[PDB]
Amino acid sequence: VQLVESGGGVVQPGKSLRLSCAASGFTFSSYAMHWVRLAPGKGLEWVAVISPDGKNKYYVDSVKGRSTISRDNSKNTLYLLMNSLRAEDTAVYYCATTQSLWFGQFYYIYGMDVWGQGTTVTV
Amino acid sequence: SVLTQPPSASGTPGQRVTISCSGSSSNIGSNFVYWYQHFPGAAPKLLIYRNTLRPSGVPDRFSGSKSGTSASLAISGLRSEDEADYYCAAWDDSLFWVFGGGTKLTV
Amino acid sequence: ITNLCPFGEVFNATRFASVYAWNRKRISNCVADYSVLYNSASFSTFKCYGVSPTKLNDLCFTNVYADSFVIRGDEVRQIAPGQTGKIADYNYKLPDDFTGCVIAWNSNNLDSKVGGNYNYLYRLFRKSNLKPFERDISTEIYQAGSTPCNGVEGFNCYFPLQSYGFQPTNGVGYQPYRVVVLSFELLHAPATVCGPK
Ligand SMILES: *[C@@H]1O[C@H](CO)[C@@H](O[C@@H]2O[C@H](CO)[C@@H](O)[C@H](O)[C@H]2NC(C)=O)[C@H](O)[C@H]1NC(C)=O
Numbered sequence: 001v002q003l004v005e006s007g008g009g010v011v012q013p014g015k016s017l018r019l020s021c022a023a024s025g026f027t028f029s030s031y032a033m034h035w036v037r038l039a040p041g042k043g044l045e046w047v048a049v050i051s052p053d054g055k056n057k058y059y060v061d062s063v064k065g066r067s068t069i070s071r072d073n074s075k076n077t078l079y080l081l082m083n084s085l086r087a088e089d090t091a092v093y094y095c096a097t098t099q100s101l102w103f104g105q106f107y108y109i110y111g112m113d114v115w116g117q118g119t120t121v122t123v
Numbered sequence: 124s125v126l127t128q129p130p131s132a133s134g135t136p137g138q139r140v141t142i143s144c145s146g147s148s149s150n151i152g153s154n155f156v157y158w159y160q161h162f163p164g165a166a167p168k169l170l171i172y173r174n175t176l177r178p179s180g181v182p183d184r185f186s187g188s189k190s191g192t193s194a195s196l197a198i199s200g201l202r203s204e205d206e207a208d209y210y211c212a213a214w215d216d217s218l219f220w221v222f223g224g225g226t227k228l229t230v
Numbered sequence: 231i232t233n234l235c236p237f238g239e240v241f242n243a244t245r246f247a248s249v250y251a252w253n254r255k256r257i258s259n260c261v262a263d264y265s266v267l268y269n270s271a272s273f274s275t276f277k278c279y280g281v282s283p284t285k286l287n288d289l290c291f292t293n294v295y296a297d298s299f300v301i302r303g304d305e306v307r308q309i310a311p312g313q314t315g316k317i318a319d320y321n322y323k324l325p326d327d328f329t330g331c332v333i334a335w336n337s338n339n340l341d342s343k344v345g346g347n348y349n350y351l352y353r354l355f356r357k358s359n360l361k362p363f364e365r366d367i368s369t370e371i372y373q374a375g376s377t378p379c380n381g382v383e384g385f386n387c388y389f390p391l392q393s394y395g396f397q398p399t400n401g402v403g404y405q406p407y408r409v410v411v412l413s414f415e416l417l418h419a420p421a422t423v424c425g426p427k
Contacts (some may be wrong), residue, residue, distance in 0.1 A: 003134065034220075036210065043208075043224050046221075087180070109155065111157055111169065111172050112157065115166045115167065116166070
């Protein structure tokens with residue numbers, strides 16, 4: 001269960017960014033992916049959840065209608081697309097893999113289990 | 124952060140320290156709250172899930188419980204190398220994964 | 231009229247059953263007064279899928295079943311044909327075709343002690359969608375994926391019963407609601423339950 005991330009370079013406000021999380025050591029198609037962020041001087045804040053099938057997904061209120069979450073099982077990759085950023089969006093973004101096998105649509109038993117390396121983003 | 128937590132806590136090494144996480148009835152009640160720890164400059168790790176369970180490789184010192192619209196965590200035999208921020212995260216009934224403000228622990 | 235039905239026993243009760251094992255009472259051989267219970271406005275929601283409630287006393291049946299349990303005030307709508315969720319999917323599902331009434335009334339004062347009640351548990355994570363009118367007291371640890379848990383708990387193995395967080399102050403949403411379902415059945419034997427003559 002090894003998770004890595006890439007992207008999130010120094011980008012000025014109003015531009016678009018793509019973050020790629022790569023996973024290994026398990027079946028990437030049997031788990032629901034989580035995206036979260038850690039802002040300086042603030043507690044961890046959830047960003048979004050994407051189901052393994054991609055049919056069902058949810059976003060946090062702050063980032064709603066200005067972002068996209070996608071997953072490629074064949075390449076075992078997780079893409080986060082951000083557009084129209086702002087000052088507060090600057091944070092270390094993290095990709096997390098649930099351990100519980102997907103067996104329905106509950107989204108409260110699905111845990112933010114072992115974490116990824118995460119990458120900084122500055123707006 | 125709908126959840127509320129004490130700004131910080133500390134104590135001697137080994138008096139069974141406790142940390143309380145408070146939230147409404149739509150975040151930590153009728154759902155589950157998981158507790159993670161964040162080391163300074165290191166990736167967070169899972170400590171307690173489902174309010175009582177524990178993952179492999181985590182010692183028996185950490186324990187957790189829920190008492191209605193609020194949860195608590197207990198660390199017995201605290202060592203000096205447990206400095207980290209403890210976060211309690213629960214699923215809001217509607218769409219959210221509410222996170223706690225944090226708990227800066229010191230020895 | 232000589233003898234009346236025991237609606238008081240199933241309505242005014244202190245020890246009131248939970249949802250995952252909903253209490254079932256069989257009523258027959260007695261005259262039932264539906265007008266008295268309908269006129270009273272104490273009942274928050276009084277729906278009747280079938281015959282009109284006001285004419286209930288004009289109908290005769292051979293058996294009626296009084297199901298009873300407690301649920302969150304928010305999800306009281308789930309007790310009705312068709313609707314699906316966490317109560318009508320894994321706990322208590324009515325058939326698509328229905329004939330009974332569904333009384334549901336608030337009971338915040340009578341329950342939800344200061345420190346919490348915790349006496350009401352609801353099922354969760356059922357293996358398959360529940361067929362109509364089935365109760366499953368089984369507490370066997372749930373499983374998914376492929377690995378079977380040997381009576382232990384962890385990832386992929388859950389405890390199917392979850393307790394409510396009833397408190398004296400929670401809002402009209404997450405407050406206890408006592409629900410009683412009066413399902414009639416014509417069957418074939420001569421009708422017994424009827425209205426006053
Ligand atoms: C359940 O108890 C309540 C409260 O006692 C009943 O409502 C009224 O109670 C008073 C005294 O307790 C009686 O004098 C009234 O006659 C009751 N109302 C009616 C319409 O009879 C309530 O009736 C009881 N439940 C049933 C099915 O009778």
